Protein: Capsid protein
Amino acid sequence: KEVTQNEGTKTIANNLTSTIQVFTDSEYQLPYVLGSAHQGCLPPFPADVFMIPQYGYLTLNNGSQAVGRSSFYCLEYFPSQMLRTGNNFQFTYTFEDVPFHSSY
Amino acid sequence: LMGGFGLKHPPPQILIKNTPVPADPRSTFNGDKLNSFITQYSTGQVSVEIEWELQKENSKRWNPEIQYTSNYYKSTSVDFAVNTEGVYSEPRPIGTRYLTRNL
Structure:
């Protein structure tokens, strides 16, 4: 959807030819930012609509400055899938053997 | 703790010795052990060959890495070479850790 401002009025229209692009990092080549207990999960209650959080990462620093080993990453440098309004995306995943959580 | 690969069965140790050659003994029997020998030493060649397995680097880092390099500027001698007297030296210790990976 596209939103345009004219004076104080706001209108929203469909843009039918625009795309979004999606990919999974399956080779673990990006800083892995899950597991830090951040907000932005899918809501516990199924009727709620949620905003998607912004991605970012940290590197090595000395104070506020970068050192020689600091890495920069462009996510456009990864192959990704482009979807118009009629397309869809899916993938599957298998967990590795892990011990049972002990509930007792 | 000095660094390396720990091994339950490391490469076996290799023992080498010159076989003693007795000097001429007395012409009448004595039962004591023989303490008089011919002086000897040996020389030769030794070869060792090791196969190493490599783990390739697969990385999406955009900017260039840190690399080990040799100094560009002029010098009285070349590093890791012989000098005027024929002596080979190693200027600095060289570690293994240059490329980077995500934690």
